[model samples]
Target: DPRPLHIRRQGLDPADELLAAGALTRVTAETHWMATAHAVVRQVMGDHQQFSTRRRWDPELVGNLMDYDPPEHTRLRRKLTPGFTLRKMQRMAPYIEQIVNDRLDEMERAGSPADLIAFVADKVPGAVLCELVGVPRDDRDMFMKLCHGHLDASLSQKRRAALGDKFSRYLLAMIARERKEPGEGMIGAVVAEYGDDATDEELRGFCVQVMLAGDDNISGMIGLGVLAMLRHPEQIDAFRGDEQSAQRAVDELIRYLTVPYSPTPRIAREDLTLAGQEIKKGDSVICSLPAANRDPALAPDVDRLDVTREPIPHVAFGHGVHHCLGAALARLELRTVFTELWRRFPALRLADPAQDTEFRLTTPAYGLTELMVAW
Candidate 1:
């Protein structure tokens, strides 16, 4: 209870407490249940009837899709689905590739001993999402700072709330512009298709959700993932091998990294028995995604990072109806970044192997605050 359920002990590994917690354990101190095993987490996340996502009893959170359940969630998800479909990702591939290359160029021009987290990882995802959601090129840096500020756990609640307010105001303005004249981004596309069917609140919620959800996850993956590969140089070829190999490596890295600590907490709608643990009505349930992904039941050699292994259905992007909506885009950005990163810098290595790497532990996603690298 006092210990956070999502904290990892070693780099790229789940906390020891979670791995030893068995399939389901109740943290009596917090009076909340933790689902740690692969099967239990999957069951809990997949069954919305038993574990509801409407955890916060606040009206303000209503617009966010992660806060809804059933008919309302389904309706909103359907309206936005077309914008994130495979076709949309395909159309955005060239743009995403260009974004990755542009960042790589910047990093290269800056010379060796660069912070990959600052130069590449942190920039790519936000830029891609901005391009997707139609955030104007001029406003992207400011918009991304607002997003990162809102998610910074070190900030006071009041400070974070103020940042969120600023973010919402910007989203409101963007939605208004889209309403007046739809552009070519996701917001404009959704506006053009489901005009009156979706309210301004709903549109703003979609933008907020996509931006917050997509940015940190992919950014963490890129930074941690590159570090993971660099630690195991033998696996580096997977990124540059071929299309199939690169895709496999990307999924493996996602599974291995498993960012975004946990999805939104799910509150029990009614009494239920999960993985032999008795859960009472209204009890909060948190799924340990990192623990579950490393469960022996999920795959062989689950603890080790194996890019060559066949991709398994990992909950890194989650499962069921509440699964990640921007999964396709995340994959595209990751594959591009990883494959291109190695291709561009075949001799890349840590700037200082002895220098301590800064791990971001306060936020929802686990990633490097700074990773100095050189070629």
Candidate 2:
């Protein structure tokens, strides 16, 4: 079975097959292995000495945090940490709320049979990032286009790489602009802290990684989470209930969907055994994130979507050295979107979602292309 799309549509049990077979199972003819057990998956991802990500997972993506290791990762992460701290996220709250509400305004203005993917989900990350990264508001539309362009695997590798190059050029321009006077958001914060120690290449790399890291997955979650909520009204109602409920709902939605089908590919640093499977140096491995998130060992009824269920700390954001840096920001974006979404359109429902729904199957990030919503 095509486990990624299958899990997106049918929830998490599609992983049970791999789980029952072994802790680490070969997923493809290529030298790829899937981590099927929760603990084993954590072991592989968290053990930096044994596994490294400074390699290509595929042709589409160039280096990002997913492809960094050692003092290199540590150095950059330390410089960037203050910007993603709780204070930074807290500072972003009202702005996040504004982003959500403004998008809701646009969606409402557009009228029903609206594509949530276009009007709400895909639009949000760009709006928030433009502010967070201190890009001009007027340029956000162009930035948004660039952010999604390279991620579209339908484009040939040459085309996608060109798009990525274009984005990198944009980052260089922005970094140059920020240097004259570092303003607010991550870019400014990094500039203030490091001064000239942060090179143009370093800043450009951070921008590309942050833009890529922050956009697609959150967009995917918003689209899929809305669809999931509409399909399960009880979960939706509970999610819309209160703070505790909303927090649980968001966590569960992330765990259940786990839109990133797998973690960034890791190359074995040396010969080793993981979950009883022997590996050679330079062997490729990835954790089936959705599969491991659903391991019953994590929690009973792991296959079920329980919005009110207490959190079990899923690996949807990953674990260890390369854990998602923008996780808190993503959560804040999601929570604001979900909360304001229900508030704005109390009667939201799919406008024949079965016919309208389209999934991104070509890339690792799973998300809906179009979702019709009417209230």
Query: Model 1: which residue pairs collide?
Result: none
Which residue pairs show backbone clashes in model 2? none
Q: Give per-residue CA lDDT, model 2, range 194-287, as digits (tens).
A: 8888778777667667876777888889998998888888777765678767877888899988888777778899998877788889887778
lDDT of 1 by residue, 173-271 (tens): 888998899987888888889897878877777776787778777778888998899899999989777888889889999998888677777899899
Weakest ten-residue segment in model 1 by summed lDDT = 54-63
Q: What lDDT does model 2 reach?
A: 0.79
Worst 10 residues of 2 by lDDT: 4-13
What's the lDDT for all of these models? 0.83, 0.79
TM-score of 2: 0.88
TM-score, prediction 1: 0.91
